[PDB]
Ligand binder design. Structure first.
Ligand SMILES: CC(=O)N[C@@H](Cc1cc(F)cc(F)c1)[C@H](O)CN[C@H]1C[C@H](C2CC2)Oc2ccc(CC(C)(C)C)cc21
Length: 382
């Protein structure tokens, strides 16, 4: 249908993920929930914690059912543990339905909730394969498609910055909202249904090819992850990219620690030298054999605005490309300014330029193709 009612249903603080409002339990208890395409568990704070403004109260819900088993979930650096159960859940600015869903009641955690955050739980939107304790714990979105009869698809339009900066965007559950993107939507295959795994076939920095065996770009996987902030790149790819961006931007010289994500670079306000930083093009495998298309990243996307309240007049930024030993993550920084369709029903992810994009006087983020290729299924790791 029209998805008018779901537009602008997402909020957030920069670097602390995007969240949607949800209700859990009878009568409904409202919580803000992190939207995470990089995990498969729906979990909510359900005991006091110094950084939680609210938490789920099982005893106040006539529909809670305890599953009498616990669950522990470690992420990249944060973790939680809790009791599993089920309860009735809905999304007030999503479709007007109620699903009985698995819920992990978080009763202890480590480096998970963030001070000042606004969210109280997390909604892992990926596949059952990566769910904890194991794949028999049906993820929230599988429940929603099974029980209500919504098409097996959602899309995400993460809009970036309009006190840390406020962000917003839209999560369209059950379809594609044509007013949230411009131009053509290009699909890449979901390689394997676990994370949302895709295949990158070529990387360019300022039109200049990185010239690596394309297997290195997906070593040992590449995923689309709304729950990670940065572009994360395997060791070798990272070093080659950081070299290419150093050279195209060599007129100014920056600390070791800038490029390690350890230190801000600051410029007197309004003096940010955008034009010395290159654009980055990631070509992704197409649906048609021997075709690819590319998405193009501006420096405005990979240099994250971050404020020092002291030197209060400057514009400061953190480098939001960073080194991985667990594969490529196309995180928030890559998804912002694009409209991303998690087409689960047809095992593909589409990209299109977003209605809320990040244009420059001279350069523009884009989604373009086709470009003819070969040995693209060779770019996958085994
Ligand atoms: C930053 C971060 O962790 N974000 C989380 C969500 C998240 C957001 C937050 F604000 C605080 C957190 F503690 C966790 C993502 O969900 C990470 N997604 C993938 C990225 C990457 C994959 C390997 C490429 O590495 C791992 C490692 C573990 C897990 C969790 C499960 C094992 C249970 C699936 C997920 C992932």
């Amino acid at each position: 249908g029209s998805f008018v009612e779901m537009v602008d249903n997402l909020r957030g603080k920069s670097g602390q993920g995007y969240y949607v409002e949800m209700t859990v339990g009878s009568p409904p208890q409202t919580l803000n929930i992190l939207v995470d395409t990089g995990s498969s568990n729906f979990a909510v704070g359900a005991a006091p914690h110094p950084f939680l403004h609210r938490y789920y109260q099982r005893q106040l819900s006539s529909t809670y059912r305890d599953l009498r088993k616990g669950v522990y979930v470690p992420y990249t650096q944060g973790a939680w543990a809790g009791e599993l159960g089920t309860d009735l859940v809905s999304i007030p600015h999503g479709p007007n339905v109620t699903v009985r869903a698995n819920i992990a009641a978080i009763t202890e955690s480590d480096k998970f909730f963030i001070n000042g955050s606004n969210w109280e739980g997390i909604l892992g939107l990926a596949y059952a394969e990566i769910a904890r304790p194991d794949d028999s714990l049906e993820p929230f979105f599988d429940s929603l498609v099974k029980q209500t009869h919504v098409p097996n698809l959602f899309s995400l339009q993460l809009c970036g910055a309009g006190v840390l900066a406020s962000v917003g965007g839209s999560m369209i559950i059950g379809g594609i909202d044509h007013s949230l993107y411009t131009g053509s939507l290009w699909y890449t295959p979901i390689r394997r249904e676990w994370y949302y795994e895709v295949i990158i076939v070529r990387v360019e920095i300022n039109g200049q090819d990185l010239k690596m065996d394309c297997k290195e770009y997906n070593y040992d996987k590449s995923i689309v992850d709304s729950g990670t902030t940065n572009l994360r790149l395997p060791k070798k790819v990272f070093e080659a990219a950081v070299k290419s961006i150093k050279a195209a931007s060599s007129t100014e010289k920056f600390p070791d620690g800038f490029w390690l994500g350890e230190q801000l670079v600051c410029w007197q306000a309004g003096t940010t030298p955008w034009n010395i930083f290159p654009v980055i093009s990631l070509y992704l495998m197409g649906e048609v054999t021997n075709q690819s298309f590319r998405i193009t990243i501006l420096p405005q996307q990979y240099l994250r605005p971050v404020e020092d309240v002291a030197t209060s007049q400057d514009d400061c930024y953190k480098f939001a490309i960073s080194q991985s030993s667990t594969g490529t993550v196309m995180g928030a920084v890559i998804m912002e300014g694009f409209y991303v369709v998690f087409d689960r029903a047809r095992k593909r992810i589409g990209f299109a330029v977003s209605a809320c994009h990040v244009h420059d006087e001279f350069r523009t983020a884009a989604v373009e193709g086709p470009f003819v290729t070969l040995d693209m299924e060779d770019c996958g790791y085994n």
